[PDB]
Coordinates of C-alpha atoms in Angstrom, one line a residue:
Chain A
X5 CA -1.0 35.6 88.8
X6 CA 2.5 36.3 87.4
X7 CA 5.8 35.1 88.8
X8 CA 8.8 37.2 87.7
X9 CA 12.5 36.8 88.4
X10 CA 14.0 40.0 89.6
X11 CA 17.3 41.2 91.1
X12 CA 17.3 43.6 94.1
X13 CA 19.9 46.4 94.3
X14 CA 20.7 45.5 97.9
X15 CA 21.2 41.8 96.8
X16 CA 22.4 41.9 93.2
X17 CA 24.0 38.4 93.5
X18 CA 20.9 36.3 93.8
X19 CA 17.6 36.0 92.1
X20 CA 14.4 36.8 93.9
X21 CA 10.9 35.9 92.8
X22 CA 8.1 38.5 92.6
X23 CA 4.7 36.9 92.6
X24 CA 1.7 39.2 91.9
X25 CA -1.9 38.0 91.9
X26 CA -5.1 40.0 91.3
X27 CA -7.0 43.4 86.6
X28 CA -4.6 45.1 89.0
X29 CA -6.7 48.3 89.3
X30 CA -8.7 46.6 92.0
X31 CA -6.0 45.9 94.5
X32 CA -3.6 42.9 94.5
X33 CA -1.3 40.7 96.5
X34 CA 2.4 41.1 96.0
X35 CA 4.9 38.4 97.3
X36 CA 8.6 38.4 97.3
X37 CA 10.7 35.3 98.1
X38 CA 14.4 34.2 97.9
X39 CA 13.6 30.5 98.2
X40 CA 13.9 30.6 102.0
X41 CA 12.1 33.6 103.4
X42 CA 9.0 35.3 101.9
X43 CA 7.3 38.7 102.3
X44 CA 3.7 39.4 101.4
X45 CA 1.6 42.5 101.2
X46 CA -2.1 43.0 100.3
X47 CA -2.5 46.3 98.5
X48 CA -6.0 47.7 98.7
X49 CA -7.6 50.1 96.3
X50 CA -7.5 52.6 99.1
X51 CA -3.7 52.3 99.5
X52 CA -3.4 52.6 95.7
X53 CA -5.4 55.8 95.7
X54 CA -3.2 57.3 98.3
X55 CA 0.0 56.5 96.4
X56 CA -1.2 58.0 93.1
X57 CA -2.2 61.1 95.0
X58 CA 1.0 61.6 96.9
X59 CA 3.0 61.7 93.6
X60 CA 0.3 63.4 91.4
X61 CA 0.0 60.9 88.6
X62 CA -2.8 59.6 86.5
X63 CA -4.6 56.4 87.6
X64 CA -4.4 54.8 84.2
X65 CA -0.8 55.5 83.7
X66 CA 0.0 54.6 87.3
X67 CA -1.8 51.3 87.1
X68 CA -0.2 51.0 83.6
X69 CA 3.2 51.3 85.1
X70 CA 2.2 48.9 87.8
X71 CA 0.9 46.6 85.2
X72 CA 4.0 47.2 83.1
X73 CA 6.3 46.9 86.1
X74 CA 4.9 44.2 88.4
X75 CA 4.3 41.6 85.6
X76 CA 7.4 42.3 83.6
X77 CA 14.0 48.0 82.3
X78 CA 12.5 48.6 85.7
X79 CA 14.5 48.5 89.0
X80 CA 13.3 46.9 92.1
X81 CA 14.0 47.8 95.8
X82 CA 13.2 46.2 99.1
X83 CA 14.6 46.7 102.6
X84 CA 14.3 43.7 104.8
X85 CA 14.3 45.9 107.9
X86 CA 11.6 48.4 106.9
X87 CA 9.9 45.8 104.6
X88 CA 9.0 48.6 102.1
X89 CA 9.0 47.7 98.4
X90 CA 9.2 50.0 95.5
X91 CA 10.4 50.2 91.9
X92 CA 11.5 53.0 89.6
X93 CA 10.9 53.6 85.9
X94 CA 14.3 54.4 84.4
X95 CA 14.8 56.4 81.2
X96 CA 17.7 58.5 80.0
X97 CA 19.6 58.0 83.3
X98 CA 16.5 59.6 84.9
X99 CA 14.2 57.8 87.2
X100 CA 11.2 58.3 89.4
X101 CA 9.3 56.1 91.9
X102 CA 5.8 54.7 91.6
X103 CA 5.0 54.6 95.3
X104 CA 6.0 52.1 98.0
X105 CA 4.3 49.1 99.5
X106 CA 4.8 47.3 102.8
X107 CA 5.5 43.5 102.5
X108 CA 5.1 41.9 105.9
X109 CA 7.4 38.9 106.5
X110 CA 5.4 35.6 106.4
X111 CA 5.5 33.3 109.4
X112 CA 5.5 30.0 107.4
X113 CA 7.4 30.9 104.2
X114 CA 7.7 27.2 103.1
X115 CA 3.9 27.1 102.5
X116 CA 4.2 30.0 100.0
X117 CA 7.2 28.4 98.3
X118 CA 5.5 25.0 98.1
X119 CA 2.4 26.7 96.6
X120 CA 4.5 28.6 94.1
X121 CA 6.3 25.5 92.8
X122 CA 3.0 23.5 92.7
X123 CA 1.5 26.3 90.6
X124 CA 4.4 26.2 88.2
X125 CA 4.2 22.4 87.9
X126 CA 0.5 22.5 87.3
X127 CA 1.0 25.2 84.6
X128 CA 3.6 23.1 82.9
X129 CA 1.2 20.2 82.9
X130 CA -1.6 22.4 81.4
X131 CA 0.6 23.8 78.7
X132 CA 1.9 20.4 77.6
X133 CA -1.7 19.2 77.4
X134 CA -2.7 22.2 75.3
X135 CA 0.3 21.6 73.0
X136 CA -0.8 18.1 72.3
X137 CA -4.2 19.2 71.0
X138 CA -2.7 22.1 69.1
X139 CA -0.1 19.9 67.3
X140 CA -2.9 17.6 66.1
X141 CA -5.0 20.6 65.1
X142 CA -2.1 22.2 63.2
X143 CA -1.4 18.9 61.3
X144 CA -5.1 18.5 60.5
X145 CA -5.3 22.0 59.1
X146 CA -2.2 21.6 57.0
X147 CA -3.6 18.3 55.6
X148 CA -6.9 20.0 54.8
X149 CA -5.1 22.8 53.0
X150 CA -3.2 20.3 50.8
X151 CA -6.5 18.6 50.0
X152 CA -8.0 21.9 48.9
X153 CA -5.0 22.8 46.8
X154 CA -5.3 19.4 45.0
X155 CA -9.1 19.8 44.6
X156 CA -8.7 23.3 43.2
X157 CA -6.0 22.1 40.8
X158 CA -8.3 19.4 39.6
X159 CA -11.0 22.1 38.8
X160 CA -8.6 24.3 36.9
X161 CA -7.4 21.3 34.9
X162 CA -11.0 20.4 34.0
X163 CA -11.7 23.9 32.9
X164 CA -8.6 24.0 30.7
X165 CA -9.2 20.6 29.2
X166 CA -12.8 21.6 28.6
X167 CA -11.7 24.7 26.7
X168 CA -9.8 22.5 24.3
Chain B
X16 CA 21.7 17.5 81.3
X17 CA 18.1 16.6 81.8
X18 CA 15.9 16.4 84.9
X19 CA 12.4 15.5 86.1
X20 CA 10.6 17.2 89.0
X21 CA 7.9 15.2 90.7
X22 CA 5.5 15.9 93.5
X23 CA 5.4 13.3 96.2
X24 CA 3.9 12.8 99.7
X25 CA 5.9 11.1 102.5
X26 CA 4.4 8.4 104.7
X27 CA 5.6 10.3 107.8
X28 CA 4.4 13.8 106.6
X29 CA 1.3 13.1 104.6
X30 CA 0.0 16.7 104.7
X31 CA 3.0 18.5 103.0
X32 CA 3.9 18.3 99.4
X33 CA 7.6 17.4 98.8
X34 CA 9.4 17.7 95.5
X35 CA 11.7 15.1 94.1
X36 CA 14.2 16.4 91.5
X37 CA 16.1 13.7 89.7
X38 CA 18.8 14.7 87.2
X39 CA 21.3 12.9 85.0
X40 CA 24.2 14.1 82.9
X41 CA 24.2 11.2 80.3
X42 CA 21.4 8.8 81.2
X43 CA 19.7 7.6 84.4
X44 CA 21.5 4.2 84.1
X45 CA 24.9 5.9 84.0
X46 CA 24.4 7.9 87.3
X47 CA 22.0 10.4 88.6
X48 CA 21.4 13.0 91.3
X49 CA 18.3 12.8 93.5
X50 CA 17.2 15.8 95.5
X51 CA 14.2 16.0 98.0
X52 CA 12.9 19.3 99.2
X53 CA 9.9 20.7 101.2
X54 CA 10.5 24.3 100.0
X55 CA 12.6 24.9 103.2
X56 CA 15.3 22.3 103.5
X57 CA 16.7 20.0 100.8
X58 CA 18.5 16.6 100.8
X59 CA 20.6 15.4 97.9
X60 CA 22.4 12.2 97.0
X61 CA 24.6 11.1 94.1
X62 CA 24.0 7.6 92.7
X63 CA 26.9 6.3 90.5
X64 CA 26.6 3.8 87.7
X65 CA 28.2 1.1 89.9
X66 CA 26.0 1.9 92.8
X67 CA 22.9 1.2 90.6
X68 CA 24.4 -2.2 89.6
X69 CA 25.3 -3.0 93.2
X70 CA 21.8 -2.1 94.4
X71 CA 20.2 -4.3 91.7
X72 CA 22.5 -7.2 92.8
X73 CA 21.8 -6.7 96.5
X74 CA 18.1 -6.8 95.6
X75 CA 18.5 -10.0 93.4
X76 CA 16.9 -8.1 90.6
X77 CA 17.8 -7.9 87.0
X78 CA 19.5 -4.6 86.3
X79 CA 17.1 -3.5 83.6
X80 CA 14.1 -4.2 85.8
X81 CA 15.6 -2.3 88.7
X82 CA 16.3 0.6 86.4
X83 CA 12.8 0.4 85.0
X84 CA 11.4 0.6 88.5
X85 CA 13.6 3.6 89.4
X86 CA 12.2 5.4 86.3
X87 CA 8.6 4.7 87.1
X88 CA 9.0 5.7 90.8
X89 CA 11.5 8.5 90.8
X90 CA 10.6 10.1 87.5
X91 CA 6.8 9.4 87.6
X92 CA 1.5 2.5 93.1
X93 CA 4.7 3.6 94.8
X94 CA 5.1 4.8 98.4
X95 CA 7.9 7.2 99.5
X96 CA 9.6 7.2 102.9
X97 CA 11.9 9.8 104.4
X98 CA 12.9 10.8 107.9
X99 CA 14.6 14.1 108.6
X100 CA 16.4 12.4 111.5
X101 CA 17.9 9.5 109.5
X102 CA 18.2 11.3 106.1
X103 CA 17.4 7.9 104.6
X104 CA 15.0 7.8 101.6
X105 CA 13.4 4.5 100.5
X106 CA 10.4 3.9 98.3
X107 CA 8.3 0.7 98.0
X108 CA 6.1 -0.9 95.4
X109 CA 2.6 -1.8 96.8
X110 CA 0.7 -4.5 95.0
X111 CA -2.6 -5.8 96.3
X112 CA -2.2 -6.7 100.0
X113 CA 1.6 -6.8 99.7
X114 CA 4.4 -4.3 99.3
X115 CA 8.2 -4.5 99.0
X116 CA 11.1 -2.1 99.0
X117 CA 12.4 -0.9 95.6
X118 CA 15.8 0.3 96.6
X119 CA 16.8 3.1 99.0
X120 CA 19.2 6.0 99.1
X121 CA 20.9 8.0 101.8
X122 CA 20.5 11.7 101.1
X123 CA 22.7 14.4 102.7
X124 CA 21.1 17.6 104.0
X125 CA 22.2 20.3 101.6
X126 CA 24.0 23.3 103.1
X127 CA 22.5 25.8 100.6
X128 CA 18.8 24.9 100.4
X129 CA 17.7 28.3 99.2
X130 CA 20.1 28.1 96.2
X131 CA 18.8 24.7 95.3
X132 CA 15.2 25.9 95.6
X133 CA 15.8 29.0 93.5
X134 CA 17.5 27.0 90.8
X135 CA 14.5 24.6 90.7
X136 CA 12.0 27.5 90.4
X137 CA 14.1 29.1 87.7
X138 CA 14.1 25.8 85.7
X139 CA 10.2 25.7 86.0
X140 CA 9.9 29.4 84.9
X141 CA 12.2 28.7 81.9
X142 CA 10.1 25.7 80.9
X143 CA 6.9 27.7 81.2
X144 CA 8.4 30.4 79.0
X145 CA 9.5 27.8 76.4
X146 CA 6.1 26.0 76.4
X147 CA 4.3 29.3 76.0
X148 CA 6.6 30.1 73.0
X149 CA 5.8 26.7 71.5
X150 CA 2.0 27.2 71.9
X151 CA 2.2 30.6 70.3
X152 CA 4.1 29.3 67.3
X153 CA 1.8 26.3 66.9
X154 CA -1.3 28.5 67.0
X155 CA 0.1 31.0 64.5
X156 CA 1.1 28.2 62.1
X157 CA -2.4 26.8 62.3
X158 CA -4.1 30.2 62.0
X159 CA -1.8 31.2 59.0
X160 CA -2.8 28.0 57.2
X161 CA -6.5 28.6 58.0
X162 CA -6.3 32.1 56.4
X163 CA -4.6 30.6 53.3
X164 CA -7.4 28.0 53.3
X165 CA -10.2 30.6 53.3
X166 CA -8.4 32.6 50.6
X167 CA -8.0 29.5 48.4
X168 CA -11.6 28.5 49.0
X169 CA -12.8 31.7 47.5
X170 CA -11.2 30.7 44.2
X171 CA -12.3 27.1 44.6
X172 CA -15.9 28.3 44.8
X173 CA -15.6 30.6 41.8
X174 CA -14.1 27.8 39.7
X175 CA -17.0 25.5 40.7
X176 CA -19.4 28.3 39.6
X177 CA -17.7 28.7 36.3
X178 CA -17.4 25.0 35.6
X179 CA -21.1 24.4 36.6
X180 CA -22.3 27.1 34.3
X181 CA -20.1 25.8 31.4
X182 CA -21.2 22.2 31.9
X183 CA -24.9 23.1 32.3

């Protein structure tokens, strides 16, 4: 998955969180939350095909914009009454949409929020663990390079002393 | 300031994960803020420097030991208790066959839970980004040295071949 902070136009004051889980080409789940409510939509490959056909765009580029847009200067839109989500690719004060998706309001949003925070805390734990091994490996590699430099200097010294 | 976010389970709500966020401006011993949240509501309490010393005294515990226990329990066997009707949070130390209360706190139901939850998530997302940056730099520094190693080793081997031939 990827969790991105976004601002909606209808609510520029606060930060929303866009959680996308999936390659995206084979349909995905998109979740929006403001820390209280949550909206979730499962986008099928069928629904994807119908969006790229309604706007006459290449699959690869379309998914590429999805990939470039959903995982993170794009703008994001969501109406809490119609529950339709869409984003635009902006360029030169000119913009166009990449389809819309329906995000149904979730009955028990606290479950989603809890899961999102747990995911982040688990990720932090995993990254710290990885860093501990990488620190040691980095230090070992620097030490081994120093050893080789000293070993190589010894060889050159022996060659030059040999010459004379 | 600094903070620590911990996952806990409550005796009275064993199924749901709660999050305990403890933060301090200077140091834990000089005052901290303790927030409990289930991802929907949040309760917060401020603990002053003098309240810590008074709690240690009421417990007939040496202040350093009391603070040491707060660190082990609130920053992360300890049990956590909270009731959404009393807004009263206490945790206990459980040794073999016996437990005892390690101080308690009265939390106040926050008025803006969503704001607190968003700020907490943002903190985690910022930490993930910083940790990913750190990993990327560590791995590049390691890989850069390995490349220099392999380059230097080409010369080392040639010098060995030259020296072996000359000393042969």
